[PDB]
Amino acid sequence: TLLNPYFGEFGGMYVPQILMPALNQLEEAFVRAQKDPEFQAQFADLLKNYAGRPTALTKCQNITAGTRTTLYLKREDLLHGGAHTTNQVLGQALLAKRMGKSEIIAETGAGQHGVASALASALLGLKCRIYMGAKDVERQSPNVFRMRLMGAEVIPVHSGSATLKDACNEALRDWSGSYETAHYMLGTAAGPHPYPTIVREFQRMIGEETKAQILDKEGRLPDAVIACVGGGSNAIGMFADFINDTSVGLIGVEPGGHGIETGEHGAPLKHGRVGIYFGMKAPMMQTADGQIEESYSISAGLDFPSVGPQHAYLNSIGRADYVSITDDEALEAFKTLCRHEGIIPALESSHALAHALKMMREQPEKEQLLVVNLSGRGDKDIFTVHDILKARGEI
Amino acid sequence: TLLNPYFGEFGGMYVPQILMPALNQLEEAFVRAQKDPEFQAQFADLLKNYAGRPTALTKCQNITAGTRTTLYLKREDLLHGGAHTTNQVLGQALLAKRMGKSEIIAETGAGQHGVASALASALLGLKCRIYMGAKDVERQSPNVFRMRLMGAEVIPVHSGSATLKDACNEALRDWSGSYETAHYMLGTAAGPHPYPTIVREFQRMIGEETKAQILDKEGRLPDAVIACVGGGSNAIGMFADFINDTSVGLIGVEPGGHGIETGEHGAPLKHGRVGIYFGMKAPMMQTADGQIEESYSISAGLDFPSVGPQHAYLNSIGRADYVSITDDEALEAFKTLCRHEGIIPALESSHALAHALKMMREQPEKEQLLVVNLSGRGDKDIFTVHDILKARGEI
Amino acid sequence: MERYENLFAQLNDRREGAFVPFVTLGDPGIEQSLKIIDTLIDAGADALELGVPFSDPLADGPTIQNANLRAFAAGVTPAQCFEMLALIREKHPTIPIGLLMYANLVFNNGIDAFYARCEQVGVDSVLVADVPVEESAPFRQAALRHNIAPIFICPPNADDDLLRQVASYGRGYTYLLSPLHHLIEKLKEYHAAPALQGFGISSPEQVSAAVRAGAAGAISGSAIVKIIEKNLASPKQMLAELRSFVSAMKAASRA
Amino acid sequence: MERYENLFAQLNDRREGAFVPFVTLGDPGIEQSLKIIDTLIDAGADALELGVPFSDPLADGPTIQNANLRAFAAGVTPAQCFEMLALIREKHPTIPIGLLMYANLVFNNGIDAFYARCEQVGVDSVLVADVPVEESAPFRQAALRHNIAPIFICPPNADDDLLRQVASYGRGYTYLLSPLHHLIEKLKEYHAAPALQGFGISSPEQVSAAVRAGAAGAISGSAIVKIIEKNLASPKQMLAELRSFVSAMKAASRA
Numbered sequence A, B: 001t002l003l004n005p006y007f008g009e010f011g012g013m014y015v016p017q018i019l020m021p022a023l024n025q026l027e028e029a030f031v032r033a034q035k036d037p038e039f040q041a042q043f044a045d046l047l048k049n050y051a052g053r054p055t056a057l058t059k060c061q062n063i064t065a066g067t068r069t070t071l072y073l074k075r076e077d078l079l080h081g082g083a084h085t086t087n088q089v090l091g092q093a094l095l096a097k098r099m100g101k102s103e104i105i106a107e108t109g110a111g112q113h114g115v116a117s118a119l120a121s122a123l124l125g126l127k128c129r130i131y132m133g134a135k136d137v138e139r140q141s142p143n144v145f146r147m148r149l150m151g152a153e154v155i156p157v158h159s160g161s162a163t164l165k166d167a168c169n170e171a172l173r174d175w176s177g178s179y180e181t182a183h184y185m186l187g188t189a190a191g192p193h194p195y196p197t198i199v200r201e202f203q204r205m206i207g208e209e210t211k212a213q214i215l216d217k218e219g220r221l222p223d224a225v226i227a228c229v230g231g232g233s234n235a236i237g238m239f240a241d242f243i244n245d246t247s248v249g250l251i252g253v254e255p256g257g258h259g260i261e262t263g264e265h266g267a268p269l270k271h272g273r274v275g276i277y278f279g280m281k282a283p284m285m286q287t288a289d290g291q292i293e294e295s296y297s298i299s300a301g302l303d304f305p306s307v308g309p310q311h312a313y314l315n316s317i318g319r320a321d322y323v324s325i326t327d328d329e330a331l332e333a334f335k336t337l338c339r340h341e342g343i344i345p346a347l348e349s350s351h352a353l354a355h356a357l358k359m360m361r362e363q364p365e366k367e368q369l370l371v372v373n374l375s376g377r378g379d380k381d382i383f384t385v386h387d388i389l390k391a392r393g394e395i
Numbered sequence C, D: 001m002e003r004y005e006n007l008f009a010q011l012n013d014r015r016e017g018a019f020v021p022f023v024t025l026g027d028p029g030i031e032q033s034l035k036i037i038d039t040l041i042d043a044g045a046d047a048l049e050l051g052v053p054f055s056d057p058l059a060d061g062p063t064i065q066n067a068n069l070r071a072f073a074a075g076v077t078p079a080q081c082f083e084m085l086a087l088i089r090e091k092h093p094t095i096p097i098g099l100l101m102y103a104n105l106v107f108n109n110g111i112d113a114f115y116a117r118c119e120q121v122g123v124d125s126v127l128v129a130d131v132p133v134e135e136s137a138p139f140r141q142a143a144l145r146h147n148i149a150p151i152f153i154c155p156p157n158a159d160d161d162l163l164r165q166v167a168s169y170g171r172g173y174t175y176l177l178s179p180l181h182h183l184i185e186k187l188k189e190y191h192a193a194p195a196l197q198g199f200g201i202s203s204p205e206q207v208s209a210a211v212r213a214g215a216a217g218a219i220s221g222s223a224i225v226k227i228i229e230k231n232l233a234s235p236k237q238m239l240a241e242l243r244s245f246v247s248a249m250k251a252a253s254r255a
């Protein structure tokens, strides 16, 4: 390889031999593109003129009242498509075309990677097929309609837990047979090298912008940046530029689901153990005898029993801290942002917000400047949430 | 009055005497605010840091293929909330607070004015009640959930056509009794003075930005700017800055519904006659004996039997041209943008696009630079459209 | 105009207050409507305020909205209303008749034309719900030209300049919307047309209360409609109920 | 390792090709599985390739996915598989036995520990589906240390460097995935372990076709599983069907 596939002991390329050539080809294209001014120009043009970068950095007006916390929201919910997922898809799509691929394969849970893949495909003239767990098709339904309207083929996966990992399985199986004409547009900073690297580099602008914005507004770096972690793309995109800024805390939030103790969560980084799956060596939710355990989260976008290798590494060296947030905590954070800031966040993003609220509430007289990555908008979640709030009497 | 309430013969203040004081108060506050640097600063801050201005100006890549047309889309679909409606609500909300009002009244059809009112209310700490026709509650359902989640009270109007005009009626009736504590946040550039004026001024940035953007990208003004017209806010916001640029064509598109000849449309500017209703003297859809006729459009946001007075005036002097687009034409334009540019537009905006496509298709060798106001995104419309495409076999 | 003067002249001579009921023309039907109107007059109404059904009554509450719907259902049009007005006037030559209109109905076939028509059928005044004094010029001028009294509403939030305008422009009577006693004083001082209390008049006490306060009478804006509504099934009872009500309201005006 | 050498040595002496059926351990049940395996051997299988059920078989098609589910349903675990392997080896001392694994099952309790266990039960080779030659170091080293042949797949898109690597690192046999005749030549030239054709082997012609082409034999990757699947209701028929199939496939290998 041209680049290092490992982050400490995590990462690698654990795929059937038949896929190695495809990965090597991708890595090569990526290295070349990165040095290609023409590529850089095109990417930047799409980000700016089509996707709507740079996204705003909004200062919360009400939710920090009565505390010494200053909270800013990196508005990825404002990106065309409705989430951070759009950034990297544009980059990958340009790569696909450069490699002469005419078809796209993708997996999605929240349907945000799915939507982004479909829009990029429509624009660049690629044929798109998307694998989505049957459970997700149901709970993130609005996104299914969007995908279909843009001409993408949506394939429901009924096997296993009928969620992200199951869609991931199907996508890899598909690619194994179609690598010649199809590019696998992996949705997160996980999987085999070079994906973790590529996705980070194509999401890097999140943190780069945040730094410039916060410095402009506050004249100093944040005390901490907080982001949810499902696969690890939005977090790493936010974290990347701050890694060398030691004074800046990096907090990743994994889904606590029903609660860690229940076993129904999606927090492998802190509660799993190293394993080999989905082409990588990383922390995983697994049984005693090495079978992959099914994750659980109210949030389709975080419902994945593993995590990107760079996160596992950052944790191990203690550069970044990882915590968990339960379903109930995320719901409250969702409700709160809606009613007090007039922003409807994705349930995924609500996990990161819930943690920031905890930080402020627990130590109200502690002076701190926080930045939360508002990874997406909650349009996709409204039917789901409404029916919960209702069943409780909060709506 | 401090300002001229008339545009030629159109406009005025045709309301029950009891509301005059409220209108005079509003006009005064507006005049004062406009000269208040503090107000200007706050407004600009919210537009930039909260709403996400300036919006991009996207050049279409595929849909103009095989023609000499260059089409740009002013991306109001990227504004927080999902439509241009957010711009003016922020301005009006600041006015409400300046006037010491604590409650907000609003009407909505598409639910976009409704959403914007709710988000602005949540942020500025105002109590919000929204009138929405029962028909609209159904066909624009996604927006009802959004409104409710943000803590707004949504009141279904079952009288008459159960659409915009009916909600307008109820809102005015409400205000007549609550003007002391409630501000009426009228959703378009129509109604009694000073609304047509205020809404134009608080939407003006659309055209101002477009001009700067197009000049930067093309080094020249557009041949024409096209926008849909329901009440007239998005069009006037786009048109305002170009009025003195005589070389620039201004095209407003009214809904043709089932077709003009069917009588089931919402095109009063071209197919109605001057009347007095909703506090203004303007072109209206009316019976021979002066009863208000019910409009019709697939698009909830355009389903209104009248139009803002400045549009009536611009037409009369021949500065702007107005056309109509049928349901079927809008649907095709919707489908096309989705599949070829990876953008899901609101059905309202699809009306304006449909006209631009007609312009290019009819005279394919005519060299022209067009700008369409993509007033909003189509998330609100997906269930509606999907079920039509389906019932036909195009999905 | 004159019919109003004659009324107030005579009313004064008996130290009586005016009792003016509001009814929607054609509610709940043409024939029944005519019957109702006869009953009000018989029961003691001093003058009449009649509404012409409008599609979008943006200044009316549910009671009047419903009335309009009933009339519309009965196939009532502005043309039919004018036909009814002729029949009424034919039967009752001296009773002052006032119309409550929406601007679009007046504007529709020309302002002047509308007022000429009123004159022809024998209408005494016209109140246009959605035309403030500020926009009234063309309306009040056409009215005057056709010997019709332009009626203006004096809202609770009226200022001095409003009082003066209304005093100047109005004829027939002033439609008061409830400092009450202060409003009366100012209007009198400005030589405004006799003031009638329009807000809240649903029971006899309110009538006497208004006269006592200095008003020339009271307008019952929806109380009558309510009775119609509730007795739809029994027209017999309806008329009986209306008779008793009006009679009681009028009696309350002798003080 | 040795069991493979002995096989190829003897096979060669009869100018016979190797016929190796793939089966999932514990499908459709423990006992029935054992029965099936006995039948394959009896019917003429030269060697065995056995799968250990893995939760997320990302390199397998629906046939094998289903097999895994059946095994899981039967309560089969990796521990049970090792128990079965012992019983098999006890009965059939010379037949070469190869395992088809997923890396997580190997990695779980330590790589070295896994291979030591294989050695103990009498397993001859291990193919790890999701470990490319590029990542194989630790796996192939532990295998060698425990006298286990590390099996590597030679994909259709193999290049010269791949061929050389596989020739160097592999033992027992080379798992070929279908220029076919060119691949064979190069592998032979590089002194790679005897090549077995793994792609498409579902009928006897394909067997003979492979041997004729220069392969040392053929692996039937899912053809057997299909028979199990279809005869779930009748184990009797299942065994009969398997017997006939294997017998026919083996016969095809004598050329």
Ligand SMILES: Cc1ncc(COP(=O)(O)O)c(/C=N/[C@@H](Cc2c[nH]c3ccccc23)C(=O)O)c1O
Binding pocket: A082, A083, A084, A085, A107, A108, A109, A110, A111, A112, A113, A114, A164, A168, A186, A187, A188, A189, A190, A228, A229, A230, A231, A232, A233, A234, A235, A300, A301, A302, A304, A346, A348, A349, A375, A376, A377
């Ligand atoms: C709005 C939003 N926020 C946060 C996340 C969490 O993702 P991440 O941890 O990468 O920052 C998602 C997930 N979006 C993808 C997640 C995804 C796509 N493919 C995957 C493969 C493995 C794991 C996750 C994904 C989706 O379901 O559409 C999201 O849609």
Ligand SMILES: Cc1ncc(COP(=O)(O)O)c(/C=N/[C@@H](Cc2c[nH]c3ccccc23)C(=O)O)c1O
Binding pocket: B082, B083, B084, B085, B107, B108, B109, B110, B111, B112, B113, B114, B164, B168, B186, B187, B188, B189, B190, B228, B229, B230, B231, B232, B233, B234, B235, B300, B301, B302, B304, B346, B348, B349, B375, B376, B377
């Ligand atoms: C996305 C989008 N595009 C275009 C329009 C057309 O509006 P306009 O002609 O003003 O540019 C709308 C309507 N939005 C409002 C329209 C509206 C609110 N109040 C009104 C009163 C009268 C007439 C129209 C409206 C809504 O139904 O939420 C819209 O939501």
Ligand code: NA
Binding pocket: A229, A230, A231, A266, A267, A268, A302, A303, A304, A305, A306, A307
């Ligand atoms: Na995870």
Ligand code: NA
Binding pocket: B229, B230, B231, B266, B267, B268, B302, B303, B304, B305, B306, B307
């Ligand atoms: Na209209």
